Design a protein around this ligand. Structure first.
Ligand SMILES: Cc1cc2nc3c(=O)[nH]c(=O)nc-3n(C[C@H](O)[C@H](O)[C@H](O)COP(=O)(O)O)c2cc1C
Ligand code: SF4
Lengths: 55, 431
């Protein structure tokens, strides 16, 4: 990961590689995440739900 | 009468003297009233003109059904088919808001007995069966005594006060069966069958107790009937509005200075008897916001529509209210209503037996829903769902107990919805 080697590598590259990391380092994303709660659903209203229409 | 003027009623217009127990409920008192008058001569061995006298009387159901009793009784001009015919009298008096049939039996059995004789003759009835509550033991004994006095005089029994038409009454009792307040449930009570009402591909008129054809009528109608057959039934037809011909007992009750029963012209304004016979509610009439017509069954009436309504049931129907035997329970504003209606629906849940599923489950459910409402825990939308339940109860239930089970809370939704939400917000604020 030495900088001269980075220079020579990007040199041969014709492209920055540091600008688009290829190997996936620190950033990733957290595995342990707070609960989803989920959407309530459109037809869980109690006032009306006759099958005659939703069907 | 024909005019907007009402609240008028002559005492001698009343068919019912000794309504309050004065002037001897004993048969001698009936004779002082000359009650047996032409009662023997009414029996001209042919219904028709008496049955037509009642058809012309304009008289309708006093069971709260409001159904034309002349036509109802017209049904048993039919040949007896070789099965003996009977008349069953509805004396359940278990219905809330209703003390009307109580004092009359306590103080005037005799006019009713003459009604059993005349109306029993009109049916061609072999007998005159009469139900009694198990709560009504002592009263059953009073009536049994007066009926014994009718036997000793020979006014009943064989031939019955002349004319030669055989006529034996048969007193009958039940036990806790409020549902026998429904007629067919009581017809079922007679066989020793449980009082869960029949579905009717055949009407009770077609098949009665023991398979032998019968008939039924509320105490008021059948008691007024002999006087319809004597005094002109057109004279009965003169009072009130035409469809609402006659008079009706008005049981003012609940929070009021002087609650009472007052038979009166059918179409008096509802506020009038409150301002008159009832003496007005405590704190004045202005406190009133909710007072219910009908026997704690029909939908509530707000004071605004209340000022306009006449006591006759058609005015109630324009107020979206049934007859309900025209029982009247006043409810003062200071008390919560939702607890009351919940208590009422609870009264239904205790008493609906539960043959057909929709009403059993419907009340068992709607009650708990009401408990959630009164506790205030409930979400505002939930009440609308209760309305849906009501819609599935009404035309589906095999009997009308569910109808009155549904209606009062329908009214509580329809008028007191903002009140409901207002109650729920307070429970919302506790956190
Ligand atoms: C004392 C009494 C209680 C009644 N209770 C009920 C009831 O709980 N449910 C019901 O559907 N009908 C009830 N009814 C009405 C009956 O279903 C029946 O139609 C009525 O008694 C006959 O009325 P009529 O005699 O005026 O024709 C009751 C009637 C009376 C007289
Ligand atoms: S409907 Fe419900 S209440 Fe009316 S009779 Fe059938 S079961 Fe009893």
């Amino acid at each position: 990961a030495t900088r001269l080697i980075q220079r020579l590598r990007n040199w041969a590259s014709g492209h920055d590689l540091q600008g688009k990391l290829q190997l996936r380092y620190q950033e990733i994303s957290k595995r342990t995440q707070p609960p989803p709660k989920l959407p309530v659903g459109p037809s869980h209203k109690l006032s009306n739900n006759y099958y005659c229409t939703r069907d | 009468p024909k005019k907007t003027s009402f609240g008028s009623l002559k005492d001698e217009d009343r068919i019912f003297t000794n309504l309050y127990g004065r002037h001897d409920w004993r048969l001698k008192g009936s004779l002082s009233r000359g009650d047996w008058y032409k009662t023997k001569e009414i029996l001209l061995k042919g219904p028709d003109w008496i049955l037509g006298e009642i058809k012309t009387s304009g008289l309708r159901g006093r069971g709260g059904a409001g159904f034309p009793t002349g036509l109802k009784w017209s049904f048993m001009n039919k040949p007896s088919d070789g099965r003996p015919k009977y008349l069953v009298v509805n004396a359940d008096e278990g219905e809330p808001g209703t003390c009307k049939d109580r004092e009359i039996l306590r103080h005037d059995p005799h006019k009713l007995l003459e009604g059993c004789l005349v109306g029993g003759r009109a049916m061609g009835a072999r007998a005159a069966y009469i139900y009694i509550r198990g709560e009504f033991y002592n009263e059953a004994s009073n009536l049994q005594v007066a009926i014994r006095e009718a036997y000793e005089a020979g006014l009943i029994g064989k031939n019955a006060c002349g004319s030669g038409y055989d006529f034996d009454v048969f007193v009958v009792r039940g036990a806790g069966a409020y549902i026998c307040g429904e007629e067919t449930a009581l017809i079922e009570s007679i066989e020793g069958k449980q009082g869960k009402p029949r579905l009717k591909p055949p009407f009770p008129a077609d098949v009665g107790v023991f398979g032998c054809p019968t008939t039924v009528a509320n105490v008021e109608t059948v008691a007024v009937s002999p006087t319809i057959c004597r005094r002109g039934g057109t004279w009965f037809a003169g009072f009130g509005r035409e469809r609402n011909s006659g008079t009706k007992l008005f049981n003012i009750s609940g929070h009021v200075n002087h609650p009472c029963t007052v038979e009166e012209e059918m179409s008096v304004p509802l506020k009038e008897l409150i301002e008159k016979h009832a003496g007005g509610v405590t704190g004045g009439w202005d406190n009133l916001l909710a007072v219910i017509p009908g026997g704690s069954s029909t939908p509530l009436i707000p004071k605004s529509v209340c000022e306009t309504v006449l006591m006759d049931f058609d005015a109630l129907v324009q107020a979206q209210t049934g007859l309900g035997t025209a029982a009247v329970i006043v409810m003062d504003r200071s008390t919560d209503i939702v607890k009351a209606i919940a208590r009422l629906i609870e009264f239904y849940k205790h008493e609906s037996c539960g043959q057909c599923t929709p009403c059993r489950e419907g009340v068992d459910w709607m009650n708990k829903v009401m408990a959630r409402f009164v506790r205030g825990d409930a979400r505002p939308a939930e009440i609308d769902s209760l309305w849906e339940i009501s819609k599935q109860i009404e035309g589906h239930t095999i009997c009308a107990l569910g109808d009155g089970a549904a209606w009062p809370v329908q009214g509580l939704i329809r008028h007191f919805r903002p009140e409901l939400e207002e109650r729920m917000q307070r429970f919302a604020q506790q956190h």
